[PDB]
Each structure stands twice: as structure tokens, then as C-alpha cells.
């Protein structure tokens, strides 16, 4: 009921890194404090590392196990965007803002970081556990994918959106907004594929899959809180970032056809600024 519509929306959102000139960001970058520059670098590396997993494994593995030519084509298109567009875009932002040696060090740090690794390996673990012709294992991986696309990226997206909403780092913020817009539709689409599997299950199996999804969400959420404090306490933003994580967790759940887990909260306004006919038969007139 939905693949051709998503095909259309995906291909009409096509874009390339070269379209946005990045050099003018140096005019606001130079005015940020060390903690702001440090947080931005670390967040950016976090997004880059997670998105690479999605391009190399997440999207291609789902495309491999999903049946249907049209679905495979849409999934291929999404994998292409990860590897050919998003990955080049993140690299471009980095090369503009930091010298080569600084980029290498930030990636070394984020590669060793406990909270980034915990979530990256949890997601990758579920992709590696998919078994041929087993729709349960595929569903679990789709849940992981939706959580990455619609939830885990957002502790990271917060900061570029925060600057973008203030008039700072506008070129890289525009790029991030385009990336985020792609991840949103990726999350919705994979969510619909997961619901298709979920709806084929018994009531007991459904309850079991719901417990899986909520348990996974809880593990990721508790690690996100730690990840958030680790990066954002030094710039005083953690409270507001936490509200943004929960709001996006609820969107991820709704993508999977589940009820929201967290109470509704308002979001930081700066980040918001960044973001049956039938005919009468000539007798109906007589009584």
C-alpha cells in the first residue's frame, strides 16, 4: 500500500554535498568557545560513525532479507543515500572545520568512547543476528534500524540544529537538516516494513515482540542519558537534550505502530527554529 509513494518521496528528495558551500561557516566557527567546538566535533563524529554502520550493514542487510522488487529498490536507494551522499557530507563538514590531525584525534576518541560504542554495537549486533527466512529476527533488526534512524541520531542532531536556530554554522546546519530529513523518511519506511511482520504474528508473539521493542528502547535510552551528560554538561544543555531524546523516542515508537512511552514535553524553541458516492435514482424524491 505504500512502497511506490515512498519511492516518489525518496527520489524527489535527492541531493548532493556540493550543492551547499561550506566555507562561510568559518565566520561563526571561529567565535565558538573550546567546549562548544569540542562538543560539536564529538557529536559530528558520533553521527558519522553511526551512519556508516547504517550504510555498510543496516540498509543493505534489510534490503537483502525483504521480499519484493519495489521494496528492494527503495531500500537500495536509501543505502545509496547513506554511502554516497550522507557519508561524503559528514566528511566535507569535518574537513572544512578542523585540520587533518584534529579530525583523526576526534575519531580516535569517539571510537574509544564507552557510550557511543555501547549503542553502535547493540544496533550492529541485531543486524548480524538476522537469519535467512526468519521474519522474527528480521523484525528485531528493523526495530533496531528504526531506533537508529528516528531516535539515536537525535542526541547528536540537537547541537547542529541548536546552532542553526541561532544563525551559527548555517551551511553545515543546512546539510544536517537535509540528512535528518532523509533519516526521518528512512525510519518511517522501515517502520512500516516492521509493522507488516508484526501484523502477521499471533497475539502471544505480538506481546513478546512488544516486550522486545520496549526492553531494547529502555537499554538504549539509559545509555543515551549517559551519552548526553558526557557531551552536553560542558555546554549546559543536557536537560533540554534529554527532552528532545524522549520526544524522538516517541516518534520512533509511533513509526513501529506502538504507543508513545514518554509523556509529552515542549522542545527548546531554538532547536525548533532549526527544525461511498452513489447517485440519486429518481425515487429518493418521493415518499
Amino acid at each position: 500500500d505504500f512502497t511506490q509513494m515512498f519511492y516518489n518521496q525518496n527520489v524527489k528528495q535527492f541531493w548532493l554535498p556540493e550543492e551547499i558551500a561550506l566555507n562561510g561557516d568559518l565566520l561563526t566557527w571561529k567565535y565558538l568557545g573550546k567546549n562548544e567546538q569540542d562538543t560539536y566535533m564529538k557529536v559530528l563524529a558520533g553521527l558519522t560513525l553511526l551512519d556508516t554502520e547504517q550504510g555498510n550493514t543496516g540498509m543493505p542487510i534489510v534490503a537483502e532479507h525483504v521480499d519484493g522488487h519495489q521494496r528492494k529498490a527503495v531500500l537500495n536507494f536509501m543505502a545509496m543515500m547513506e554511502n554516497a551522499v550522507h557519508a561524503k557530507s559528514y566528511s566535507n563538514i569535518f574537513m572544512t572545520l578542523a585540520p587533518t590531525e584534529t579530525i583523526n584525534e576526534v575519531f580516535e576518541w569517539v571510537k574509544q568512547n564507552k557510550y557511543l560504542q555501547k549503542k553502535a554495537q547493540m544496533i550492529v549486533g541485531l543486524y548480524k543476528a538476522i537469519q535467512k527466512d526468519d521474519e522474527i529476527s528480521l523484525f528485531k533488526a528493523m526495530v533496531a534500524s528504526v531506533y537508529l534512524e528516528s531516535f539515536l541520531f537525535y542526541s547528536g542532531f540537537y547541537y547542529p540544529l541548536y546552532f542553526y536556530g541561532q544563525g551559527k554554522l548555517m551551511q553545515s546546519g543546512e546539510i544536517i537538516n537535509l540528512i535528518l530529513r532523509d533519516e526521518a523518511i528512512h525510519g518511517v519506511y522501515v517502520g512500516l516494513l516492521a509493522q507488516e511482520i508484526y501484523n502477521k504474528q499471533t497475539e502471544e508473539k505480538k506481546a513478546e515482540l512488544r516486550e522486545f521493542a520496549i526492553d531494547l528502547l529502555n537499554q538504549l535510552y539509559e545509555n543515551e542519558l549517559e551519552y548526553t551528560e558526557d557531551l552536553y554538561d560542558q555546554v549546559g544543555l543536557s536537560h533540554d537534550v534529554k527532552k528532545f531524546i524522549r520526544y524522538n523516542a516517541n516518534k520512533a515508537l509511533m513509526n513501529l505502530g506502538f504507543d508513545p512511552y514518554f509523556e509529552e514535553e515542549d522542545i527548546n524553541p531554538i532547536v525548533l527554529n532549526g527544525l461511498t458516492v452513489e447517485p440519486l435514482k429518481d425515487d429518493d424524491f418521493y415518499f
Binding site: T276, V277, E278, L280, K281, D284, F285, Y286, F287
Partner: protein
């Protein structure tokens, strides 16, 4: 979760396969004892409470100054002597969340039900202590419920107007359109709903000062009005609500209807403006015969004949318009337009349907004007005259707008107390007082029409509740017999009270002499026909109550001819939604939508069984969506024959019903004399 809410939620928990209806009494008792008594401000005596309320700018001191404190104390004792108890949690919750006066911080409760009733009665009595006691007995017995505006605002310093329904005629000119926008904003600022007649505006593509194709049509004015209502949204506490009415023969009818299509472009789409259509018998006749129809350009007709299209008799002037070369018209398919109306109502519930010839074949004030449109609730049907607003420094020709203050009889309580006459007369007195004390200083036509016509709307509620609690099916002929008798009695006593008021004040309403009351043509069916119950079961329901006969109607006709009538219009059955919970009654005369109402208040879900619902009357509490809409139309037509204004008639449709079924229901309602159809609700 609150303890009372947990008790209420036990309603749905089936025990012995039966709903625990007794849990609602426990729920209401817990609600009171744990929240209302705690959060109710304490006053040593009534004198101290009154002083605190007056000084702290809570009450208007003028109306309370007409009574010695002894009389106020007597009235309050009369209200409190009843020891009134809310029978369900939802009634008390609704009262203490919507109408109970609260401190400026909305933290404590300053008014109980008795306090509000006493204040309203003292406001009504206008210095009469015995009359105030009578009003207190009427309201505390819940035989009469003043409309939400009157009930909430009476006797309060920081209050909106007690009248909340206004109808505005708009003349075809920029001055008139701007004045209409200003008046709509002023009236919505007061909290009242505003209905505007756009049939006199010229259609899209008409000439403005001998320059052709200059007019934007009714859709541009609709966008203006929608933005005006959105701006004047009552300080955000209640979004501004307005209604636009267009005659079906207006050329902009298709563009007017398309503003409610979901697929409509945001530029043309109107979001917060309700739309109603006025359908003359000519359109229904054309659709019935499948003949090609024409929609006319109003300004060409005005230039050719000197009158507006909606000011003329379409049934007579349609052929002349079609044959006049100087009148511009557009060919349409009447049946296609009917089907478009049905589909639009199925998708969105719009437009409202006003059957113009049904309204005017019984209209008592056609000499003043024909009824051209209805209000935002589709139950107000009065003669209006368009105003001519001229350029600055020129004199405006102020016409007659429409406004009526509403009150509802509680049918179950009135019948239990056998007090149709007394309740009707007291409600008429209170509505007359509300109309007299109302003065809108920014709507000249509204103020002039209120002063001249003295129009009131006396409605009724709890028809389905009263019938179900008496073992009568809403769709049964016995229910229609009871409705016929009850509303005949209500009309008789409202007419008698209007004549008595006219005699006491020695004054009728403007242009009464030309009305059907003055000539006696109004009473023809009452003097020639009998409306006593035809079923022994229904006739027993009226035991202890005098049912007016043909002789009584002849005497009333003679009395009216001798003394006249004070009110141009008296009766209109408004939807009466919010205060139905407080009254513990079914809304208006419509059948119940659901036996138990599931509501969400905060994060707590509340369960509201239909008032009086139980195991033994479960079958009689049939839901509206399961009823035959033809039988509902029969009921409303039986009631409508005794209402001078309209009845707010909602259609309850199942999702399986096609547009053909909706069209058939509309055509049967038009055949059965229905005046307006309010909403097409689908399940």
C-alpha cells in the same frame, strides 16, 4: 489517579456481567468529599461571602443592591434547603470545572451549585424576592436550565454577554463587508457565535463600479471572516466560531462548498468557519425532475429588479430570472449539487442545510422579512433586515440582526413535577429579563433588533432520557405522541406568557400587527386540531397536568388578538451540550450517541453512563447511530410543528451508508417539514 476517578472507572468493570452503575454515586461522593469540600473557600456567613465576592470584583454589586440582605439570605436558604445532590460524577465535575466560580488563580472554589443557582435567581428576579425564590426552586429542581452564557455569567462583574448567538446580514459593498468583519470580531470577543448571511454578496467575476470581473465573490469574504474569527478567538480560551450561509442559487455555491473540501487548497480552504446552505423548494423541485438548473449572479439581479436575489421569492422569480437576458446565470446540475452536498457532509459534516420554504411556510413574521439563514447551531430562524453601512461621516441605515438568549426545559424534571405551565412561564420571564438587560454597543443592528423584536429561545432537553426512563422507544409512535403533546403544551404556555407580558407592559414587538399572531392565522391548526395524547400510556404521563384543548387554544387566540405578543420568536431547541451534564440529561431532543460516554480529562479517563441508564432500561437507551434516521426525522418534525424557530437536528450516520442514503434522509426531512439539518455525524 484520584480516588473518585478510580471509583468512576469501576463503572465499566463488569460484575455478574452487568455494569456497576452504583459506582458512579460513590464516585461523585468521593469526588465531593475529597476535592470539592477541600478546595471550597470557607466563609463564616453569607454576608461575609457576599461582601468578599462584591469587593474582590467577582460579582456585580448593582443587581445585588436591589435586595435587602434578609431577602438574599432567604433566597440562598431556599436554594440550599433542597439539599441537592449530583447523581453522577460527571455532573458535578462539569459544573465545578466550567461554571463554578473560582478564585482569580483558579485554585479555590468560591461558588457551589446552590450559590450559582441563587445568584442566577437573584439576577433574574431583578429585585423581586418571591420571584427570586421561584427561580431558585425552578433551577434547583432542575426543571429549567439557563443557557451556558447566562448560567455562567449572570451576576458576574468580569463576564461576557448573556446572549451567545448572533446572526448578521451583510450588504453587497466594501463598507458593509468591513463592518461585518468588525461586528463579527466584536461579537466573538464577547464569546458569542456569529452567523453571517453572504447571499447578498455578488458572485465571483462580477463588476465593481462598471468594471467587469472585479469581484472576488463570497470566498474572499469567507477568508476575511475566517481570519477575523481566528484573531478574535476569545483570548484563546475558546477559538472564535463563525458560520457563513449562502443560498443554493448563489453562483458562488460550488466555490462556497469547495471551501470545506479536504483536498481544497489552503488559499481557498476555510478552517474555522462553519458553512450552511439555504435550499428553497425550487432547488428540490429542480433536482427531483432532473431538470438543468441555473445559479444566478446576485448583482445582475439587483440591478435588473432593484432587489436582492435572497429578498425575492425564488419559487416565483426563478423562471423570470432564467428568461431575463439582463440577469447572468450559470447552468448547474441540481442532482449533482445535492450529491456534492451529501458527500461533503459525509466527509466533514458540512454544510448545514436550511430548507427555506419549510422555515417560511410557518414563519409568523414574514411581513417583517423572510427567514434567509440560520445561526452557528442551525436552530435560530427569525426575520432579519440587512443594514446599509455608508461612508464615514454619513448616516448608516441600521437594519435588523438576529440574536436570542436561550434556556432549556428539563423534560424529565418538568414532567415529574407536572409543571409545564409554571416552568415555561418562569423560563419566559427569565429569558425576557436577559434580553432586556442585554445591550451590545458595537453591533447596531443586533442591539436594534433585540430592542424591537424581543426574541427569546426556550429550548428543551432530556427528551430521550425522559422517554427511556419511562420505557418508551425514541422511534416509537408513542414517543412522537408524547413529544407532540408536550411541545404543544410548551408552545401554548409560552404564547400565553408572551401575551401576558405584552398586556402587563402594554407593548408588543415591532410590527406585531402584521404577524400571523395578530391576524390569527397562527392558531389555525391549534383551533382546528387536537394534540392530546392518542395513546393511553402517553396520556397517563400527563396525569395531573391540564392539556390545552381546542377551546383553550381559541381562548388564547382571542387573548393574543386583544393584547398582542411581546416576543416575535419564543422557542428554539439549541444543541445544549455542556450544561446537559450538570442537568444530568440527554442533550437537546436528539437521541443519545452512546449509552456510556468515555471522556479523557488530563491523563484520567472518565466514564459517563447515560442519565438514568440501568439494566432494565438498557434497551430503551438505544444509540442514535443504530436508529432509523427516518424515525428521528419523524420525531423532529413532530416537535418542529410546535416550535416557531428551528430545532438543531444532527444526523447520525453509519460508515456503511452511502451518499445516496444521506440524500434520501435530507429529502425526507424536507418532505416532513424539517427546517434545518445541523450535522452529519458518522460512526
Amino acid at each position: 489517579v484520584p480516588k473518585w476517578i478510580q471509583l468512576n472507572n469501576e463503572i465499566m468493570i463488569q460484575k455478574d456481567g452487568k455494569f456497576q452503575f452504583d459506582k458512579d454515586k460513590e464516585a461523585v461522593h468521593s469526588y465531593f468529599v475529597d476535592y470539592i469540600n477541600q478546595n471550597t473557600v470557607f466563609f463564616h456567613n453569607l454576608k461575609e461571602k457576599l461582601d468578599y465576592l462584591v469587593e474582590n470584583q467577582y460579582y456585580e454589586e448593582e443587581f445585588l443592591s436591589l435586595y435587602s440582605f434578609e431577602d438574599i439570605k432567604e433566597v440562598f436558604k431556599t436554594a440550599y434547603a433542597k439539599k441537592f445532590r449530583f447523581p453522577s460524577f460527571m455532573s458535578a465535575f462539569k459544573f465545578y470545572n466550567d461554571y463554578a466560580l473560582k478564585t482569580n488563580d483558579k485554585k479555590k472554589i468560591l461558588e457551589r451549585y446552590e450559590d450559582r443557582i441563587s445568584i442566577v435567581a437573584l439576577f433574574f428576579a431583578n429585585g423581586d424576592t418571591e420571584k427570586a425564590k421561584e427561580y431558585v426552586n425552578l433551577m434547583i429542581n432542575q426543571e429549567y436550565q439557563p443557557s451556558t452564557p447566562t448560567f455562567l455569567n449572570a451576576g458576574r462583574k468580569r463576564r461576557g454577554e448573556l446572549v451567545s448567538c448572533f446572526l448578521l446580514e451583510v450588504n453587497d459593498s466594501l463598507n458593509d463587508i468591513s463592518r461585518a468583519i468588525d461586528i463579527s470580531m466584536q461579537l466573538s470577543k464577547l464569546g458569542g457565535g456569529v452567523s453571517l448571511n453572504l447571499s447578498k454578496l455578488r458572485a465571483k467575476g462580477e463588476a465593481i463600479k462598471d468594471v467587469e470581473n472585479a469581484t472576488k465573490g463570497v470566498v474572499g469574504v469567507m477568508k476575511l471572516l475566517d481570519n477575523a474569527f481566528r484573531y478574535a478567538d476569545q483570548m484563546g480560551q475558546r477559538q472564535g466560531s463563525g458560520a457563513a450561509y449562502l443560498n443554493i442559487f448563489h453562483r458562488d455555491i460550488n466555490d462556497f462548498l469547495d471551501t470545506k473540501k479536504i483536498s481544497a487548497d489552503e488559499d481557498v480552504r476555510v478552517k474555522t468557519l462553519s458553512i450552511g446552505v439555504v435550499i428553497p423548494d425550487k432547488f428540490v423541485e429542480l433536482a427531483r425532475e432532473d431538470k438543468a438548473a441555473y445559479v444566478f449572479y446576485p448583482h445582475t439581479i439587483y440591478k435588473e429588479y432593484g432587489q436582492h436575489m435572497d429578498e425575492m421569492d425564488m419559487n416565483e422569480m426563478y423562471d423570470k430570472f432564467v428568461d431575463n437576458p439582463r440577469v447572468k446565470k450559470e447552468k448547474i446540475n441540481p442532482r449533482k449539487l445535492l450529491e456534492k452536498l451529501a458527500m461533503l457532509r459525509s466527509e466533514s459534516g458540512y454544510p448545514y442545510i436550511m430548507f427555506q420554504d419549510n422555515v417560511n411556510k410557518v414563519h409568523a413574521n414574514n411581513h417583517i422579512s423572510k427567514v434567509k439563514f440560520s445561526n452557528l447551531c442551525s436552530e435560530v430562524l427569525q426575520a432579519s433586515q440587512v443594514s446599509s453601512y455608508t461612508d464615514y461621516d454619513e448616516e448608516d441605515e441600521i437594519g435588523l440582526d438576529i440574536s436570542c438568549n436561550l434556556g432549556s426545559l428539563n423534560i424529565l424534571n418538568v414532567m415529574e413535577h407536572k409543571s409545564i405551565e409554571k416552568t415555561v412561564k418562569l423560563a419566559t420571564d427569565s429569558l425576557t429579563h436577559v434580553s432586556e438587560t442585554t445591550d451590545i454597543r458595537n453591533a447596531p443592528a443586533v442591539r436594534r433588533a433585540n430592542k424591537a423584536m424581543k426574541s427569546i429561545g426556550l429550548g428543551a432537553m432530556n427528551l430521550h432520557g425522559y422517554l427511556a426512563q419511562n420505557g418508551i422507544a425514541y422511534e416509537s409512535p408513542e414517543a412522537r405522541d408524547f413529544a407532540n403533546t408536550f411541545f404543544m403544551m410548551v408552545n401554548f404556555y409560552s404564547i400565553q406568557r408572551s401575551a401576558e407580558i405584552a398586556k402587563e407592559k402594554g407593548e408588543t414587538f415591532d410590527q406585531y400587527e402584521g404577524s400571523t399572531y395578530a391576524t390569527g392565522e397562527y392558531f389555525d391548526k391549534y383551533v382546528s386540531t387536537d394534540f392530546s395524547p392518542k395513546y393511553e400510556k402517553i396520556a397517563n404521563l400527563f396525569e395531573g397536568m391540564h392539556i390545552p384543548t381546542t377551546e383553550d387554544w381559541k381562548k388564547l387566540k382571542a387573548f393574543v388578538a386583544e393584547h398582542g405578543m411581546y416576543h416575535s420568536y419564543r422557542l428554539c431547541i439549541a444543541p445544549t451540550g455542556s450544561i446537559s451534564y450538570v442537568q444530568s440529561s440527554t442533550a437537546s431532543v436528539m437521541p443519545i450517541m452512546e449509552r456510556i460516554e468515555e471522556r479523557t480529562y488530563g491523563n484520567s479517563k472518565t466514564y459517563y453512563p447515560m442519565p438514568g441508564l440501568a439494566s432494565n432500561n438498557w434497551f430503551f437507551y438505544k444509540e442514535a447511530y443504530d436508529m432509523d434516521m427516518f424515525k428521528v426525522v419523524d420525531m423532529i418534525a413532530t416537535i418542529q410543528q410546535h416550535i416557531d424557530q428551528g430545532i438543531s437536528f444532527t444526523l447520525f450516520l453509519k460508515d456503511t451508508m452511502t451518499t445516496r442514503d444521506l440524500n434520501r434522509i435530507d429529502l425526507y426531512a424536507h418532505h416532513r417539514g424539517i427546517k434545518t439539518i445541523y450535522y452529519a455525524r458518522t460512526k
